[PDB]
Design an enzyme around this catalytic site. Structure first.
Site, PDB file in Angstrom:
ATOM      1  N   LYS A 159      79.573 -58.274 -73.702  1.00  0.00           N
ATOM      2  CA  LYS A 159      80.994 -58.585 -73.948  1.00  0.00           C
ATOM      3  C   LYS A 159      81.944 -58.143 -72.834  1.00  0.00           C
ATOM      4  CE  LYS A 159      80.122 -56.275 -77.670  1.00  0.00           C
ATOM      5  NZ  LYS A 159      80.170 -55.522 -78.945  1.00  0.00           N
ATOM      6  N   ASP A 195      77.327 -51.933 -84.825  1.00  0.00           N
ATOM      7  CA  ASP A 195      78.402 -52.379 -85.719  1.00  0.00           C
ATOM      8  C   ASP A 195      77.892 -53.217 -86.915  1.00  0.00           C
ATOM      9  OD1 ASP A 195      80.047 -55.029 -83.662  1.00  0.00           O
ATOM     10  OD2 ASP A 195      78.018 -54.325 -83.650  1.00  0.00           O
TER      11      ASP A 195
END
Ligand SMILES: Cc1cnc(NC(=O)c2cc(Oc3cnc(C(=O)N(C)C)nc3)c3cc(C)oc3c2)cn1
Ligand SMILES: OC[C@H]1O[C@H](O)[C@H](O)[C@@H](O)[C@@H]1O
Ligand code: NA
EC number: 2.7.1.1
Length: 448
Positions: A159, A195
């Site tokens: 990311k 996550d």
């Protein structure tokens, strides 16, 4: 103007936008390839070459026994950095969000973890507690090869993250070292979770049927409860262990090649990790708006949009934000929302331009929903097979701005997962402060 000409323009727009289409058979192929890649990642013989890493988390299905008290939670990798104080007795939370500077995310690991520790210090002062040494759970949204629940190495940044001196090192160690350099607080790092893992755990607290965690925000990933006998990388065949799929890397060995359009290659080539996280690149919020921007430039070039002229802002990288895709699709039909977004991008849009922009947005977001569905269906289908269940009833805990805030993504995705999951009864649950809560709950269980 001319209504016949406006229509001929929309018909050519459609012929170009048709390339985004995925038939049910294309989705079954993508699903079967995902499943093939999941089997490969799990096995000792193919793990090193598998693009879908199926990483063991060391988070196990446990009989119970949770510790009580105050637990600190860290959340890194999503939208900003988060510190949360969690009280387990019942679970209540206090939390703060910090904006990560670019110089920390793109400098050294030392700068990144120094800033992280500065934030922890600030949270502890604001809640008057830099004196109490608490058990700490770390949500770290990147691929990690675990040795244990509290020990694992960063495989690679994803990311857009680029901090030097992180890849190949123990993340808990980098964190612990940063806290020692600062020397103004003490914490006992008990667990490091992805996550997806944190989301599954916090969602499970509300619904014990929750055994899958899914993220559709900046990135796209999933975790699920695998049978220990299938987890070849961890000795033992009793019970279950949470596996971080790291499915964003699906297609990195060419598995999605026939579906990659020109816009996908450009987004990838101009990305921080080219040739990596290609499936994520089809779904993720870090790429979605950029994909729409590229399609709009193509339509400007064919003289189908904005009188064939693109503004400086339309030719600016990351200028068409993912939230604008969500907002364009929110538009009630009056075109006011589409108009304002385009005006702010220095364009003079006609009613036709607004409609064409609406169409490019739906073509990209519907593709993301469909690609994402093939992945969830593969995970769910595999679980039904592994557990040898006639009808499998499972709950999927989901977090992220794309799944949460996009107006039709969630609906298109559910309907597509359903079509691909016969003999499966799937409940979808949205996490209320997912990550932070999750990392502390794993910490309470781990802290025995
Ligand atoms: C070393 C190690 C190994 N495995 C684990 N394993 C775990 O921590 C753990 C916690 C879980 O979720 C929980 C959520 N809340 C609570 C709760 O009510 N608390 C008060 C905490 N308990 C469990 C789940 C749910 C699944 C499907 O697997 C889990 C593993 C933790 N540590
Ligand atoms: O944040 C969602 C996901 O983004 C990326 O795919 C990360 O590699 C993964 O670890 C994370 O779960
Ligand atoms: Na095993």
């Amino acid at each position: 103007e001319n209504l016949y000409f406006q229509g001929m323009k929309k018909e050519k727009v459609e012929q170009i936008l048709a390339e985004f289409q995925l038939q049910e058979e294309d989705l079954k192929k993508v699903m079967r390839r995902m499943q093939k890649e999941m089997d490969r990642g799990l096995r000792l013989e193919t793990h090193e070459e598998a693009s879908v890493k199926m990483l063991p988390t060391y988070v196990r299905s446990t009989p119970e026994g949770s510790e009580v008290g105050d637990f600190l939670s860290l959340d890194l990798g999503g939208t900003n950095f988060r510190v949360m104080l969690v009280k387990v007795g019942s679970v209540k939370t206090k939390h703060q969000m910090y904006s990560i500077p670019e110089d920390a995310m793109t400098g050294t690991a030392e700068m990144l973890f120094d800033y992280i520790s500065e934030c922890i210090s600030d949270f502890l002062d604001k809640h008057q507690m830099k004196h109490k040494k608490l058990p700490l759970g770390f949500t770290f949204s990147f691929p990690v090869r675990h040795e244990d629940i509290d020990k694992g190495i960063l495989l690679n940044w994803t990311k857009g993250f680029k901090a030097s001196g992180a890849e190949g090192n123990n993340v808990v160690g980098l964190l612990r070292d940063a806290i020692k350099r600062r020397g103004d607080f003490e914490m006992d790092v008990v667990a490091m979770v992805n996550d997806t893992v944190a989301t599954m755990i916090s969602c499970y607290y509300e619904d014990h049927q929750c055994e899958v965690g899914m993220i559709v925000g900046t990135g796209c990933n999933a975790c699920y409860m695998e049978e220990m006998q299938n987890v070849e990388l961890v000795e033992g065949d009793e019970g279950r262990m949470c596996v971080n799929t790291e499915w964003g890397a699906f297609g990195d060995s060419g598995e999605l090649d026939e579906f990659l359009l020109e816009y996908d290659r450009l987004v990838d080539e101009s990305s921080a990790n080219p040739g990596q996280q290609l499936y994520e690149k089809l779904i993720g919020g870090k790429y979605m708006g950029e994909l729409v921007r590229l399609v709009l430039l193509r339509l400007v070039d064919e003289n189908l949009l904005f009188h064939g002229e693109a503004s400086e802002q339309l030719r600016t990288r990351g200028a068409f934000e993912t939230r604008f895709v969500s907002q364009v699709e929110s538009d009630t039909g009056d075109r006011k929302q589409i108009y304002n977004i385009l005006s702010t991008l220095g364009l003079r849009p006609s009613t036709t331009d607004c409609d064409i922009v609406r169409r490019a947005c739906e073509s990209v977001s519907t593709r993301a929903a469909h690609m994402c569905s093939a992945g969830l269906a593969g995970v769910i289908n595999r679980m039904r097979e592994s557990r040898s269940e006639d009808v499998m009833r499972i709950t999927v805990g989901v977090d992220g701005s794309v799944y949460k805030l996009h107006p039709s993504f969630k609906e298109r995705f559910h309907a597509s997962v359903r079509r691909l999951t016969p003999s499966c009864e799937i409940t979808f649950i949205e996490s209320e402060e997912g990550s932070g809560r999750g990392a502390a709950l794993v910490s309470a269980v781990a802290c025995k």
